[PDB]
Amino acid sequence: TYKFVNMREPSMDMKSVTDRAAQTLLWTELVRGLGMTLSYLFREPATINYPFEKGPLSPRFRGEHALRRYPSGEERCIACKLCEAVCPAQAITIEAEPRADGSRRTTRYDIDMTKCIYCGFCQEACPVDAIVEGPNFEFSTETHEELLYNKEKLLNNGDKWEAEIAANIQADYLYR
Amino acid sequence: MFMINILSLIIPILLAVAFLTLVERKVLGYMQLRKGPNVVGPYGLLQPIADALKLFTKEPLRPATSSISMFIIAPILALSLALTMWVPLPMPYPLINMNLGVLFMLAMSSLAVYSILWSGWASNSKYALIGALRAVAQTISYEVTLAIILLSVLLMNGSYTLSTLITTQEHIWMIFTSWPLAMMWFISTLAETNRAPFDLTEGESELVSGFNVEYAAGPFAMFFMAEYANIIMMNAFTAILFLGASHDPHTPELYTINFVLKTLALTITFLWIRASYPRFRYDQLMHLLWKSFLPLTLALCMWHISLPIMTASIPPQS
Amino acid sequence: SRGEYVVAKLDDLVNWARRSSLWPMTFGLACCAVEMMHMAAPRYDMDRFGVVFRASPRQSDVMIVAGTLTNKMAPALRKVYDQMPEPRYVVSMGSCANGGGYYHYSYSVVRGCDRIVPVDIYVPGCPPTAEALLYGILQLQRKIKREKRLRIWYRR
Amino acid sequence: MNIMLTLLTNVTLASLLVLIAFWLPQLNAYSEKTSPYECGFDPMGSARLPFSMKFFLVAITFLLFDLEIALLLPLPWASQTNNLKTMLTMALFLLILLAASLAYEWTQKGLEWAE
Amino acid sequence: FGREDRFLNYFASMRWFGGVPLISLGKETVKQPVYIVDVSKGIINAIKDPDAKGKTFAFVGPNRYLLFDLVQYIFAVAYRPFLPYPLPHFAYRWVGRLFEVSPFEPWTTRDKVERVHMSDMTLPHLPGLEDLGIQATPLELKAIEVLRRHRTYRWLTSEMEDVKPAKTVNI
Amino acid sequence: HPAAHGVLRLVMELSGEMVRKCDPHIGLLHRGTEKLIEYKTYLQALPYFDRLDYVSMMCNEQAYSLAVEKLLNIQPPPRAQWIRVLFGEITRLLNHIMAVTTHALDIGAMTPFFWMFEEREKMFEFYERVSGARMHAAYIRPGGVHQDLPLGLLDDIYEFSKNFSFRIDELEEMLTNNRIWRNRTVDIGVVTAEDALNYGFSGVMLRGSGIQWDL
Amino acid sequence: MWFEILPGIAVMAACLFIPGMATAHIHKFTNGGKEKRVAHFSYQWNLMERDRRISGVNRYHVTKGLENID
Amino acid sequence: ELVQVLRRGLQQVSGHGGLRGYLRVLFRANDVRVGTLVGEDKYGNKYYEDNKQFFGRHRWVIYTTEMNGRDTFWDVDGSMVPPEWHRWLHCMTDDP
């Protein structure tokens, strides 16, 4: 099923011919375009007052990464390296060894944020919800080296944003 | 005392140009569902000052391949000519009273094109050259018909003196007698000031910055000021020529207020037109001005020569 | 001292004028330029901050590297950076311009635009949201508020 | 005298603006910065090479049509003569001749640009 | 001498005035300029050389030039008209003093005039660039990269082997 | 160049302003995507298709997912396919807004761009609510879709759709009957049906010449 | 909004008011307060010159009425 | 109905505590709308809502003048919002 976009034929009577002559000589369609711009002039604009007003986001939004803890304070990450395996940009570097108490924990957990594509695959792959993309998106830096995160930076981000990260997870885990 | 008058003319015009930049930005923003400048200063009232201070504290570049003398002369000519074209305008009294004011505006405006011509040539770059030849073509398009329209309109004034236009329209606006000529004159002034839809010389989508692409900082700023002063001046000329304010010799302030309101309305119409339309192709502008405007202008010139004689309505002051 | 006060006030005035009138080049490379356009769109209206795109490098103050920089493109980017009159600023937008991103290990991609030009601000994301780019622009403004050119000249 | 003073004042103000623009800011000129702009790549030829004019015929016609403007400008004063029948015949004769020249060039494809 | 140098560039700047004022017409001054990259490489090599602990080096170019010939060559490479005229030492010193009052970087100083018209010492008892593995670059191979910026548009494309190297007072 | 639509070195041969030859130089955005894909798993290669055509992301995801599903001999569930077609049509609207408004901007009409990019912003909000990312969601996957819709998304999609036609009408009032627009567009870049077929054209580039084809 | 565009328009209007009012006031101040004379033709210039000669203060604006003819 | 708009403007002036507060909120935030106070941070940020505005302008924050160590009378940024108010302010939840 198809339709034509430009397959019409104008009328050839005196009335319509004079109508088209008046359109040519008196600029009616140009007046209509001016009228549309004038109409837009008197509407309320769509601009928000950033940074005092913010754009709407959702609980699924993918932001700056963080490492999470159990309610007791023990880390969730167990150095399974699934996030490192699945990362499409090879942005995660991990080293691990038995902790002094025998726990399976990391000694290196680095994310190159200038390599990351922010796809969120790492948090899907994680089996204990240790690595997440948190809601923060305002973390521009003045140097390149400030965007190469190590384990201390990610743990600090987790401790800093947990109050919001946990609420965001509570709102979406039933879709996961 | 005369130098005080020159300064009282030229400084407020520059301030009006500076704030016309902001007014244009805000009008375009609100016609585009946004706001425009509203941060630096209450309602963007300090934005023009910031723009000027940023431009005049920025490094000016002299191109390696460019002719330096013409490269520097062109913006000086532009700004000085834009300032000079204001002195014969009666508001209701002119700064310089001439017998032939209209011919003075014609000559000075036709001299103003050499600013673009020489800046584009002296830049010695390809986009600047293309802008300059577009300027040549645009002048060839609009000049003859502009002059004939002026003659046809002034055939009811009786002279070329700008102040006589006030007494000619003492009872009725001249737009009720020559509205087709008013329409053609309005389009001609849009083309003469390189304004959309006839902003061919800059050609932003097509030619990057066009004729002034090489220019930066303070020299660049002078070109912008000259163009906007020309906008305001041409709209003031149109208001005087077609919408004549009534002048009380014991209260010129009323005339000044009314005339300023009319020219502001015409300038806002210029901004509206820019916000509303796409750009012409520069051969299409020449075809419009030579195949549609020119024959009608010749016919209307014949009509406006004949009409005062037929009706015994010839103006005074041979 | 009187001279210190005068140079401090003049530095404040010049810095305010520079940061309130920031004209970026009309220049984009890849995906990130779509978010740049959305930052120019009505909802965010970068023009309301005094930020106006200008096509010519001679009339631009900031370069936003928005997209992947390839080896074929690097000389052109460097060339249009050199033709910007000073003072000039560079903002690196997106993972690709920051350090290569998804194409960091390719044979034809520059691993970060900061190998070619000096960078003032790095905006993370793939792509960063228009709000994040606005945050980075305002951060660059705050950085311009902090420079001491006339005070350092006076201290010489 | 007044117009000469006005011209001098305007030219002086523009010149002073140029002088301030060139002597106030800090200049850092080097060869790459001052090279010609062609969208980031070096130009092939020179900008001083011949640039074809496709509307050359219309430009010559502009020279002739411009001089008929000088013939028509004194018309406001010519309307004050006693023999209005001779003057009106001559004003229309000139304008008809000018319309005939436009009609001739139009029909001979003189207004079309060269390809 | 180099792209950002105050040597070759300094001479080029003098053309705006008209003539080039030289003390004794530059016929009693001998210069041995050295390329910037040679100096930087020599410093880098002295860092990596274990024998250069307490040594003292003299980095000089391969050729010695009279000041008149050096300035004539500089003006020839930039394709500018060369107008040398002799200025007495006191007059030049007076001129230098006037320029010095600039609160910004002075165009010239009394000290600059003194050092410009002073012959370069010969210290054959000190080790040089060649003792760090560096073959010094002559001015005739690197002058164009500094002086092409000082040409007009008419001479911008002229090649390096066109400007006929100057005479060196060697040995 | 503002009208270069990104990174294009179009070397042009001109007599006056007439064009004698166009020589498009490309590769200024060649990132070596196909080799990189050769170094990843099928799930890992999926985000590359977002960044191929960054104005139509989910459509590229759908094409790649259909190819992988065909090679796997599996079938997505019906709800996944309905979601895929819904978001493919939303993506088509996004792409057509971009194309038309930027074409008008090149030609010199700036206002419709601003009018329509607000609708683009709302559709970006739909993208983010379904996937967490405004433009490179990576939602459509070879087995279906990554996640189900949130509980109130269909209502907002309906609210957007019941009003989008008036925005289209305003754009049309600005452009369709304008004589300047018609002067700049009518009889420009005419291509015959046979030449379009031979040169390998597709989509609107075929349909504008009368060819009745649509996949 | 649209009424926030108004302050810029008001500033422009105030700027554009200045030339006309300043010219009118300066004309009045330098011509005895009575609207500076216009001389488009030689006859008006001759009248102005005659006025200047009989004023006695070398200024055309000062006017001698019936009290100057005894 | 013009008088209604003018009176609305005068009550906007009055609702910011007078001319001083009106000018402070006009020069700090470039906005003089009056909303309903939702709560206050321990850092000094205040939060307002006005459901009659369209989506995106119905919530906002007036930033504090002094955070940990720096004077933020003029220099403010979105990163001064704590995570809980961050979640409320970006409309990721309905509950403050």
Ligand SMILES: CCCCCCCCCCCCCCCCC[C@@H](O)O[C@H](CO[C@H](O)CCCCCCCCCCCCCCC)COP(=O)(O)OCC[N+](C)(C)C
């Ligand atoms: C005579 C002609 C030549 C000289 C022309 C001079 C033009 C007049 C100068 C204009 C003065 C106005 C500039 C000051 C307005 C700034 C307003 C205020 O906000 O500035 C604050 C403080 O301002 C600066 O600290 C100091 C600015 C002024 C410096 C001292 C004034 C010097 C005047 C001297 C004039 C003499 C000129 C030289 C003559 C040769 C910083 O806030 P800001 O970051 O913006 O906004 C944050 C954005 N928010 C609000 C949305 C969150």
Ligand SMILES: CCCCCCCCCCCCCCCCC[C@@H](O)O[C@H](CO[C@H](O)CCCCCCCCCCCCCCC)COP(=O)(O)OCC[N+](C)(C)C
């Ligand atoms: C709006 C239009 C009207 C406004 C009215 C004012 C117009 C002002 C005039 C236009 C010039 C404004 C520029 C202001 C900056 C100064 C520029 C120059 O004159 O200063 C130096 C001039 O000095 C010279 O270099 C040498 C010093 C003085 C030369 C000696 C000549 C003999 C004079 C006698 C001095 C003895 C004491 C003086 C008191 C009696 C040049 O230094 P230079 O680095 O190159 O140029 C860059 C300037 N930077 C550093 C700010 C970026």
Ligand SMILES: CCCCCCCC/C=C\CCCCCCCC(=O)O[C@H](COC(=O)CCCCCCC/C=C/CCCCCCCC)COP(=O)(O)OCCN
């Ligand atoms: C009783 C005796 C009376 C004698 C007769 C008097 C009545 C005569 C009635 C006819 C007068 C008509 C005058 C109109 C002049 C131009 C008409 C025209 O045809 O021009 C258009 C072109 O005109 C335009 O389109 C304008 C282009 C630029 C548009 C820019 C924005 C539009 C302007 C907005 C409103 C302007 C208001 C003007 C007056 C302002 C106040 C001074 C032709 O172009 P095409 O349609 O492509 O066809 C030509 C080849 N077939």
Ligand SMILES: COC1=C(OC)C(=O)C(CC=C(C)C)=C(C)C1=O
């Ligand atoms: C209207 O002003 C603007 C431009 O100038 C024509 C642009 O180029 C752009 C960039 C988009 C084009 C296609 C380069 C934007 C976003 C814009 O707002």
Ligand SMILES: COC1=C(OC)C(=O)C(CC=C(C)C)=C(C)C1=O
């Ligand atoms: C969608 O197509 C694109 C353009 O046309 C609208 C662009 O202008 C640009 C870049 C230029 C502007 C300044 C965004 C890019 C990267 C692009 O992808």
Ligand code: SF4
């Ligand atoms: S979001 Fe994607 S690219 Fe970034 S670290 Fe996680 S898996 Fe790697």
Ligand code: SF4
């Ligand atoms: S963050 Fe999660 S997926 Fe990655 S190593 Fe730790 S437990 Fe495994």
Ligand code: SF4
């Ligand atoms: S960083 Fe991501 S969004 Fe930006 S250009 Fe690269 S792939 Fe595209």
